[model samples]
Target: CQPTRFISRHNIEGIFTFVDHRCVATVGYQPQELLGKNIVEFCHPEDQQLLRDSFQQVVKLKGQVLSVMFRFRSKNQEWLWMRTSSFTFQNPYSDEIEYIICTNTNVKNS
Candidate 1:
């Protein structure tokens, strides 16, 4: 899943929609590995619900940065601790979530 570029936009379910730059090797996979895929699919089973709930809150409210730290799987098949800080775009009319604009960052596993 080599990414063409990095700065990413995701769907309400956190599927990758558009990307800006290639932030290389964070998880050893490319953007296509993540594009059109559910974010939680890469998460540790225990972390899935946590990410889903975080997504829910971001959809309900935007503008504020919502950071979710969880264990995610790498392309090599090991779990790595990571954090995603997300911002959302929504209709001012406030019914539909435009998309999830977000980034993935690494965290030292403790």
Candidate 2:
């Protein structure tokens, strides 16, 4: 089960989409709010391309366990450090590629 209680209309928005990982779901923000948004939307424009590439790499190397450290915008619009891990799992019923799970953990500031 997802942490519904912990994930309210605050914190970082949770996003998921089929076929395109660019989909986003944010609190206090409507689905249409992020319709044209990308993870790079919150990223510094200079880092945009790099971030996109990293996400692409994760999608490319599906079925493998991979971890990456990156930065994302918090609900407060502050840059927060996060470590994300991706695990891929194939659905026994379909040929479509799927990532079973992925997670982000905030890093404490020094």
Candidate 3:
């Protein structure tokens, strides 16, 4: 998937991690905003535990990383389905070590 299309407004809409760039994705909010925020920022407080568990598993599994389906809150305060696939790989720069790359998709029922 294209990097440009990976952004999502579901959940907190605050800054979130993208690829290994440490870049952030957030929805339009008033006043100040988050910069260089991690994926934990946008996750719902209640789902934080579940997310943490899954993240740990993903890291532990390493090369076995596969698609994961879960729910996240949307910018409008609605729950939306999100499926992500992650894998660790060496970057072209060679300066950085193995990094986790993932694509976030929106799967909301119409």
Candidate 4:
């Protein structure tokens, strides 16, 4: 409806460490509430395994993954169909690798 867009960065543990305001608004949650939460918890149970596998592949390869479509549970308990493009990269402040950035778009209607 609102272009269904959001940006986020997840730590190695698969927890959201950074979420853009657009994501907060789209998911109907405050950034603070989501900052330390696991992204898997918000994914549809049936899709969680797919998400986990994709995450693992991206992290292992340290590169981009083709766009994936999944269902993410929003704050109101509604499942929003989302298409996400993900990429893994090293954290600039640390020598160890630890981040996956994703751009999500709501694609329920599409």
Against the true structure, whose lDDT is highest? 4
User: Could you say which candidate leads in TM-score?
Assistant: 4
RMSD of 1: 4.4
The TM-score of candidate 1 is 0.80
Taken over the whole model, the C-alpha lDDT of each candidate is: 0.76, 0.48, 0.49, 0.82
What TM value does model 4 have? Answer: 0.84
TM-scores of all candidate predictions against the true structure: 0.80, 0.56, 0.54, 0.84
Q: Rank the candidates by lDDT, best first.
A: 4, 1, 3, 2
Report the C-alpha lDDT of model 4 over 1-110, residue by residue, as the tens digit: 36768888987667888988897667788877778888888899899988888787777774756467889888888999988888887857888966799888878655
Model 3, span 56-80: residue lDDT tens:
5655565576566556554566555
Q: 1 or 3: which has the higher lDDT?
A: 1
Clashes of each: 8, 0, 4, 0
Lowest-scoring 10 consecutive residues by lDDT in candidate 1?
1-10
lDDT per residue (tens digit) for residues 1-110 in model 1: 44222367878876778754463467767777777788888899999999999988887674678888898888888897887888887778677747888877767766
Candidate 2 local Cα displacement, residue 48, angstroms: 2.8
Compose the digit string of candidate 2's lDDT tens values, residues 1-110: 33211111111122333212222332223445544355457565655666566666655674585665566665566666655566565677998645435554555446
